[PDB]
Design an enzyme around this catalytic site. Structure first.
Site, PDB file in Angstrom:
ATOM      1  CG  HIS A   4      -1.927   1.074   1.269  1.00  0.00           C
ATOM      2  ND1 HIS A   4      -1.917   1.993   2.290  1.00  0.00           N
ATOM      3  CD2 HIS A   4      -2.963   1.405   0.468  1.00  0.00           C
ATOM      4  CE1 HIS A   4      -2.912   2.847   2.124  1.00  0.00           C
ATOM      5  NE2 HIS A   4      -3.565   2.504   1.010  1.00  0.00           N
ATOM      6  NE  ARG A   5      -2.204   5.699   0.681  1.00  0.00           N
ATOM      7  CZ  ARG A   5      -2.858   6.436   1.572  1.00  0.00           C
ATOM      8  NH1 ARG A   5      -2.224   7.358   2.278  1.00  0.00           N
ATOM      9  NH2 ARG A   5      -4.146   6.235   1.776  1.00  0.00           N
ATOM     10  CD  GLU A  54      -2.313   1.544  -3.564  1.00  0.00           C
ATOM     11  OE1 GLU A  54      -1.691   1.916  -2.547  1.00  0.00           O
ATOM     12  OE2 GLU A  54      -3.463   1.949  -3.861  1.00  0.00           O
ATOM     13  CG  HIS A  79      -3.956   8.919  -0.749  1.00  0.00           C
ATOM     14  ND1 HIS A  79      -4.712   9.815  -0.013  1.00  0.00           N
ATOM     15  CD2 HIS A  79      -4.733   7.841  -0.972  1.00  0.00           C
ATOM     16  CE1 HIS A  79      -5.890   9.281   0.237  1.00  0.00           C
ATOM     17  NE2 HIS A  79      -5.929   8.068  -0.344  1.00  0.00           N
ATOM     18  CD  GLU A 135      -7.175   4.700  -5.799  1.00  0.00           C
ATOM     19  OE1 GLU A 135      -6.465   4.103  -4.955  1.00  0.00           O
ATOM     20  OE2 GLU A 135      -8.215   5.341  -5.507  1.00  0.00           O
ATOM     21  CD  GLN A 143      -5.724   0.483  -6.682  1.00  0.00           C
ATOM     22  OE1 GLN A 143      -6.496   0.064  -5.828  1.00  0.00           O
ATOM     23  NE2 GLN A 143      -4.511   0.932  -6.383  1.00  0.00           N
TER      24      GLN A 143
HETATM   25  O1  LIG Z   1      -5.760   4.271   0.570  1.00  0.00           O
HETATM   26  P1  LIG Z   1      -6.831   4.728  -0.408  1.00  0.00           P
HETATM   27  O2  LIG Z   1      -7.595   5.933   0.119  1.00  0.00           O
HETATM   28  O3  LIG Z   1      -6.305   4.938  -1.834  1.00  0.00           O
HETATM   29  O4  LIG Z   1      -7.975   3.580  -0.423  1.00  0.00           O
HETATM   30  C1  LIG Z   1      -7.970   2.546  -1.421  1.00  0.00           C
HETATM   31  C2  LIG Z   1      -6.850   1.551  -1.203  1.00  0.00           C
HETATM   32  O5  LIG Z   1      -5.601   2.235  -1.121  1.00  0.00           O
HETATM   33  C3  LIG Z   1      -6.749   0.580  -2.345  1.00  0.00           C
HETATM   34  O6  LIG Z   1      -6.444   1.314  -3.523  1.00  0.00           O
HETATM   35 CA   LIG Z   2      -5.057   3.485  -3.233  1.00  0.00          CA
END
Ligand SMILES: O=P(O)(O)OC[C@H](O)CO
Ligand SMILES: [Ca+2]
Length: 234
Positions: A7-8, A34, A49, A102, A137
């Site tokens: 995540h990030r 990600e 983000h 994303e 995504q």
């Molecule tokens: O962390 P966010 O706000 O991008 O929430 C979605 C998750 O990261 C999965 O993309």
């Molecule tokens: Ca995300």
């Protein structure tokens, strides 16, 4: 048969959305790095983000109000790493890593176009590309449909804070590969229903070994975590 998504990058251990953080994610066993993307004033894509750089950088302002050059020349991440563009990340890792990317809202055809342009330039989509090297995504159905119209073979994940049969049916209708629900909405019954419809389930964002164990028992196909080292303790 299971996808571990950083995540990030490696957010629990280092600054989000830095090349150092993406590398750390790979080092800690992530299958995918990600990226969240925001469109600059000059229609470039920044790894960011939030709509604004205020929270995570030495700068302030909406990404859409500044050129990529202005952002990268003037500001750094909180702990001094450069703020990377999509181009910087793809130039750094090329075809050696898998990307989970994303398109942030609002929906913008310029963001979709620039994303596909940069991926195509590296051979990560289109002819000769490996299916699953790139998953795209979005919360914006409009972004996923626009991308699906242009590059029909890219696996698409629909992001949702709920997990309903109506959302699964929409995923099928539009040819999406995965539904990506907030992990606290997931039940084994709902995962089994998603699977019966031919959808994968990618849960976000799970940060404890206990909650990881629960999701794996429910049969999720992957999850996004800030703490990759916790997966090794399951
Ligand atoms: O962390 P966010 O706000 O991008 O929430 C979605 C998750 O990261 C999965 O993309
Ligand atoms: Ca995300």
């Amino acid at each position: 048969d299971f996808m571990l998504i950083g995540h990030r990058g490696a957010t629990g251990y280092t600054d989000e959305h830095t090349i150092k953080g993406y590398q750390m994610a790979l080092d800690k066993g992530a299958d995918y790095i990600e990226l969240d993307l925001q469109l600059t004033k000059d229609n470039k894509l920044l790894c960011m983000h939030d709509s604004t750089i205020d929270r995570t950088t030495t700068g302030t302002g909406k990404v859409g109000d500044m050129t990529l050059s202005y952002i990268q020349t003037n500001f750094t991440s909180l702990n001094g790493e450069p703020i990377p563009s999509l181009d910087d990340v793809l130039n750094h890792f090329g075809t050696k890593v898998k990307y989970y990317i994303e398109t942030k809202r609002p929906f913008d055809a310029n963001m979709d176009r620039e994303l596909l342009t940069q991926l195509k330039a590296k051979g990560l989509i289109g002819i000769g590309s490996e299916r699953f090297q790139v998953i795209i995504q979005s919360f914006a159905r409009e972004s996923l449909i626009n991308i699906h119209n242009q590059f029909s073979n890219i696996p698409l994940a629909y992001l949702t804070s709920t997990f309903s049969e109506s959302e699964m049916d929409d995923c099928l209708s539009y040819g999406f590969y995965a539904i990506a629900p907030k992990y606290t909405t997931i039940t084994k019954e709902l995962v089994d229903l998603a699977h019966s419809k031919g959808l994968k389930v990618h849960a976000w964002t799970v940060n404890t070994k206990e909650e990881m164990q629960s999701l794996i028992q429910m049969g999720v196909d992957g999850f996004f975590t800030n703490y990759l080292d916790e997966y090794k303790k399951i």
